[PDB]
Design a binder for this molecule. Structure first.
Ligand SMILES: CC(=O)CC(=O)SCCNC(=O)CCNC(=O)[C@H](O)C(C)(C)COP(=O)(O)OP(=O)(O)OC[C@H]1O[C@@H](n2cnc3c(N)ncnc32)[C@H](O)[C@@H]1OP(=O)(O)O
Ligand SMILES: CC(=O)CC(=O)SCCNC(=O)CCNC(=O)[C@H](O)C(C)(C)COP(=O)(O)OP(=O)(O)OC[C@H]1O[C@@H](n2cnc3c(N)ncnc32)[C@H](O)[C@@H]1OP(=O)(O)O
Ligand SMILES: CC(=O)CC(=O)SCCNC(=O)CCNC(=O)[C@H](O)C(C)(C)COP(=O)(O)OP(=O)(O)OC[C@H]1O[C@@H](n2cnc3c(N)ncnc32)[C@H](O)[C@@H]1OP(=O)(O)O
Ligand SMILES: CC(=O)CC(=O)SCCNC(=O)CCNC(=O)[C@H](O)C(C)(C)COP(=O)(O)OP(=O)(O)OC[C@H]1O[C@@H](n2cnc3c(N)ncnc32)[C@H](O)[C@@H]1OP(=O)(O)O
Ligand SMILES: CC(=O)CC(=O)SCCNC(=O)CCNC(=O)[C@H](O)C(C)(C)COP(=O)(O)OP(=O)(O)OC[C@H]1O[C@@H](n2cnc3c(N)ncnc32)[C@H](O)[C@@H]1OP(=O)(O)O
Ligand SMILES: CC(=O)CC(=O)SCCNC(=O)CCNC(=O)[C@H](O)C(C)(C)COP(=O)(O)OP(=O)(O)OC[C@H]1O[C@@H](n2cnc3c(N)ncnc32)[C@H](O)[C@@H]1OP(=O)(O)O
Lengths: 263, 267, 267, 263, 261, 261
């Protein structure tokens, strides 16, 4: 049991805990409290002994356009200092949600129904397995354009999943990680090659294949294996989370991102 | 330049940035915003090219009794759904403040010296254990980390600093059973570099006496060497501290959300 | 000098210590004692100062179908309380053998080359992934790690080797859903350094052809440089592999003791 | 539920899982299967949600004189090779029991009623807290005298708990870690200063103090704190366990320890 | 302010500190003091607050054929050990360190092949652009009686994979264009003729000027500072071990024999 | 087989390779080439299969007063950087590495104080025995305008604790006998007069001969091999970073000024 959120729903079907971003008119842009909510849903799925897979699905043509810029503007009018304000508004929320993904014990699968940007794209890169709707998906990490730095564990996940040199080209120059680069790095495990106009049919088709794939598997093995796999990089992720959120503060406090967030 | 805080002052004397906890009537108990303020002062000292040493001093008979429990009660009474959930509330009230201040100490590039004028407790005691050098007023100082009694876990990097500075076995005895790290234990582990053996009734004299000795000790030294050496020494455990900070702050959340610490903070 | 094993032979030709799995009628399935024997052969090669390369070759259409399931059934039927508990039994039958052979591969100082003449499965496929260089007979080879289907977890250092050599996401897809790492995936990750594109019906010709090319490739090289370079390269991940070996072998115990794999090994 | 072992008993009193070595006539020397049994008891305590502390107590004048040398002689007469034999008899048992201690999630307390030697002394050094009966206790790691190397995680635990230089003096020259050195390094948290002739009264007195000390504590905090503390060195211990057991093999296979075990 | 070097020039254009290897007749082979000079240039660029990108460009058909073998023959000392500590150890540990710690975005304009220590430096850069599909990297340590240098112990498995690294290093085989492209080592191939490195160099600078427009450059550096921390310890450890372990090879004499022919 | 050095001798007695600093009139101050020579001696002892213990002994009232300041003044080069790479970087990275990797049990007979790089080497030994309670270690980096050397970045916090390390290093204070004994840095104080280092040296060797009786010596080495792996990576990383970061101090000139007076 958890509060309701009109932008994000969830349900459980057998061993699958399914989270659904349901705000396609706003390209599933997320406010701080929505990222927190995502973290709480992961933590709920993590405590449920019948759940073995946590599946993140979205809606419309974008997976998520990232942090809601209107909400960011709203966070500019209560705090004794700029530092205090950003510690509460940015630091807290980013460390919490990134942590929830890093430590999650269930197999985390992203159904990528369209592009993802910023912190939302970081979360995609923290998932264990990614399936794409079609070859038009991309991930964009526009930190250099926003006057920010790496977020959501991307310091670690991008070099790990895309290579160091590619990561520098994309991050330093604000270029997307496109479908081709995702496929070449084995970031996407299956492209479903469905039309962008029916995320819903894509979402259902992934779940249908997943039901077939798990048949006959000893599901506790999935979790036991993930527990060992996670240990390869868990320290690097936790270290990155702390430094990312604290090093980003000076950018917020300087003011550059607020200017740029307001074209 | 920075806002004023009636509980914590600072000044600069030569190469020393001196922070002073100045609320002895409340045993220098600190609220969330005071911890944040401390972090901001460290960051100010860290950016000042004339500063080589950041000296933390307090007042009265306690260094600091830790987090202000009245302020914690404040942060429980809501007004009225200011936060969408208990989780959101504690992310903002506890997680944010702890990760920020702990980080400010962990990364600080100036030599960080604690003048321990009495006992320290909880998160304040964690900040003491993050300092590079500690001087004690007398043999009645102790550090207490009462997490087991409060329904909490390690904070402020103590997951790393205590085993590092006191040994693993001693750390488990103290933390698991809510027992203080007393003067004798501090001295046996070289945690305290000098005991000044002054009366507890004059923190001011102790504070002045440490500053006086420091002015003498720095004479003739090449101060950029101090900082260059610290830069290398810090790299021994920087990763462990950064990893611990993130994990401590997130793992404590379930204790707050469960409610146990609020019950206990209210007896 | 070492005992003989009718399933695995070896010989030395110049700087090459050549190990040959020679039980094609049973797809070179291996029992516990055969894995141990493999470790002993590696240790023999490692002590021979004339050996610079340890080459592992097999026979027939499979490199190895993995652990021999008949032998596993053998190790279930007791005779009759030979072991005081299920735990004791599996410590001796599984834990011991896996930690030993995995360690022999992880620490091996000679250049370890796998001639992949067909598919490999399970612990045998883990040993392939521990080799420094892999050459394939043709594009029908694959590696399968069917742990999820057998009620087991990662073995033979695959916790480390698979994400390292295939990427994390691909590893989770294959391991979580019991899907093979196919030729195309091997080639895309540079796991296979050369595909010889020969028919599956002649592992012998493939084996000979790899040895022939190797004799050519080593000409003019300073062979101690190969070993010196490997010594440094190994240090990149040696700690991760040693940590994984201990954890894999101990964490698998509860799966054996629970009984699930025995059920499944028996269909 | 677990098989019975005439040399080692256990029971549960409230939040305490108490393990008792009960073979004082043989100085609580332990055979391979007894070390395995200890591991299984730890694993049982670890799975019991009412247990917060796992307390290891012994009997008589020695905590344990270490591996039973008669049993070692017995392991010399079935295996295709010396290697196979030692993999089964030594490697398996050492990795298993050392692992059980390294990963144990409950607070592990050793009641040190007398000296400990060899692998038994390694296990004492893996405990979180140690209480001594009196100032005559010592730990001896006689590997250099037996033609062996570090065991039971001592590669890590001894430098960690006693310092590097002291560890080299003791290990290289087969010298004990005596009471004074234990106290100076804070290895012993309390010396009870009771007579060596009543381990039983010592054991009971520790339990009596423990019952008093836990009053008012939030016990899940103890475990939550241990979980974080353990992470400081967990990787080093797991790495050491694997290399210790595999590097010791060549000593067994060479034969030196068997000669020496037989004066 | 720094001494001049006839083989290597530099200049600054806006946020770009541009280093230019300018000895094409000798395939930009470099002597010890030239490697040191490269390090000093990186350290100069690193201290300049207006610089955000350090761009390494070369000349002619080769990026660099590596260490100058005539200079090695050219190389007072109480022992062989002392000699090689001074001639090889010192220089390698210094220049490798300068690249490992550099805080500005390091971009290599790869105008042709690179070999040996020069190829190690290419592998330490953050971004690599190639002139055409004839570029390759060669690490001929096994043929020279040497071992890994310039952080290659770490950079090659990291950027090319472990298995591929072993095949190339153990058997003295090049990392060719195709292998570079499949591992994303090259971020863009400009597909220009090998006969005009200058035009390639100018074209990269032109595209860079376009790509930085609108970016908040301190973000580039802030991000690099975090990214660097993923492997900084491994690189520092490898540098020390590479330089010390190679000593026994030099002292044994094998490389000197082979460097002759 | 190795060159002779008038300041440092060695010999082998059974399983002991004994190195003897024999320049008491100059308090066994060591020049660069002497540090290199020490490294070469360790590497010789390490390759000798009959050696299980490498014992470092000195002469007179000091173990060693550290780097020879006359030799530093004495210290052709295209730049200050090149000079210090060759004179300081090379020598420090080499000798520190020789101690860090040494596989035999390394025992220091501390016959008096040690300073600077020599004191760093003492801190890298596995076991230390003191002549009497007047020994101390001094690391005067802050007074010389230098930083940590010889692996002290790691060895001092490891062997003395972090807080104590900061007090001593930041303020140029000695690690005295009492601090050494409280941290178990000294395994035995022989309590002999400072006027007879020779007798102390002989007495330690005598006790060592007694202590090894009955031990299986390959166990000593097998155990050390594992023990070393606890911190080997940290020491190798520190060596590289120490030697490179000190460069800017030498190049700035401060230490040379101060080394004068
Ligand atoms: C592409 C680059 O290279 C540029 C950069 O790196 S700089 C930063 C990149 N972009 C961002 O950070 C956030 C914006 N993301 C986007 O995708 C841009 O909106 C886009 C113009 C590129 C997409 O265009 P599009 O597909 O036509 O979507 P668009 O019509 O803008 O959005 C649909 C609605 O959702 C809203 N929305 C989308 N993303 C949002 C966000 N992050 N915050 C708030 N609202 C958002 C839009 O404002 C719009 O609302 P209205 O109908 O009220 O105008
Ligand atoms: C056996 C153990 O090991 C016991 C344990 O304590 S476990 C719980 C740990 N304690 C805490 O968390 C810290 C809170 N403070 C204390 O427990 C006690 O104040 C102390 C034992 C540490 C000191 O004892 P003391 O000198 O008698 O304190 P006291 O006289 O109350 O302090 C003077 C004033 O400062 C106030 N104050 C002190 N610490 C405070 C805090 N952390 N928050 C808010 N107010 C505080 C007191 O309430 C008091 O104000 P009033 O006179 O207006 O009530
Ligand atoms: C969809 C998936 O991804 C499926 C999965 O398989 S998950 C379970 C993974 N499989 C295993 O663990 C390995 C066991 N072997 C096999 O599954 C199958 O043999 C295989 C599919 C890998 C190969 O298919 P195949 O060529 O038809 O094998 P098969 O003809 O049985 O082998 C020839 C002989 O070798 C024997 N043999 C092969 N592998 C053996 C093993 N691991 N243990 C004992 N005997 C074995 C066979 O039993 C057979 O002997 P008989 O003719 O006397 O019965
Ligand atoms: C002290 C050193 O420095 C020497 C060394 O390092 S080398 C190895 C050190 N010792 C060992 O490894 C194992 C032996 N441990 C001991 O404590 C020696 O028995 C000791 C002589 C030093 C103790 O003397 P003690 O207190 O009089 O005990 P002791 O009378 O030997 O033992 C009581 C009984 O328990 C038995 N026992 C004790 N430890 C045992 C072991 N590890 N294996 C088998 N049986 C054992 C004894 O054999 C004896 O049985 P009996 O009555 O049948 O003779
Ligand atoms: C079996 C094998 O496969 C051999 C190996 O790979 S192992 C050795 C690999 N290569 C090295 O170690 C570096 C030495 N350089 C070379 O071998 C060659 O330059 C090369 C094979 C890389 C390319 O060959 P190329 O394009 O024909 O070079 P070339 O046109 O001769 O170069 C022009 C001039 O620069 C010189 N030069 C090139 N590299 C040099 C170096 N590292 N040091 C000094 N001078 C060098 C050439 O010697 C030549 O000078 P001269 O005309 O005065 O003799
Ligand atoms: C404020 C402070 O507290 C100062 C500091 O600590 S910072 C500087 C610390 N010390 C150093 O850096 C090393 C230099 N050595 C010394 O200062 C002194 O030797 C010492 C203080 C360590 C001991 O003093 P001492 O016991 O009186 O030495 P002394 O009897 O003069 O030595 C005998 C000879 O050896 C020489 N010697 C000692 N150390 C030497 C070195 N490192 N290089 C060259 N020669 C040296 C002395 O100069 C003297 O030679 P001359 O008679 O030819 O001048």
């Amino acid at each position: 049991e958890i509060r309701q959120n009109e932008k994000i729903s969830y349900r459980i079907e057998g061993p699958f805990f399914i989270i659904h971003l349901i705000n396609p008119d706003n390209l599933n842009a997320l406010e701080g409290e929505d990222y927190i909510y995502l973290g709480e849903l992961l933590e709920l799925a993590d405590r449920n002994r019948d759940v073995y897979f946590t599946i993140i699905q979205s809606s419309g043509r974008f997976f998520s356009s990232g942090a809601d810029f209107k909400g960011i503007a709203k966070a500019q009018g209560k705090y004794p200092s700029e530092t205090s304000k950003w510690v509460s508004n940015f630091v807290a929320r980013n460390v919490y949600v990134t942590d929830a993904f890093i430590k999650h014990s269930k197999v985390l699968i992203c159904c990528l129904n369209g592009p993802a940007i910023g912190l939302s794209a970081a979360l995609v890169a923290l998932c264990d397995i990614v399936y794409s709707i079609n070859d038009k998906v991309y991930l964009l990490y526009p930190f250099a354009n926003l006057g920010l730095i790496t977020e959501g564990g991307t310091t670690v996940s991008l070099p790990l999943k895309f290579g160091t040199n590619t990561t520098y080209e994309c991050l330093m120059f604000n270029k997307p990680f496109k479908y081709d680069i995702m496929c070449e790095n084995g970031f996407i495990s299956k492209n479903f090659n469905m039309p962008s106009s029916n995320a819903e049919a894509f979402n259902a088709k992934v779940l249908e294949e997943l039901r077939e794939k798990v048949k006959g598997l000893y599901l506790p093995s999935c979790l036991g294996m993930k527990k060992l796999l996670k240990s390869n990089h868990i320290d690097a992720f936790n270290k990155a989370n702390s430094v990312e959120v604290n090093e980003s503060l000076k950018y917020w406090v300087d003011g550059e991102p607020l200017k740029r967030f307001r074209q």
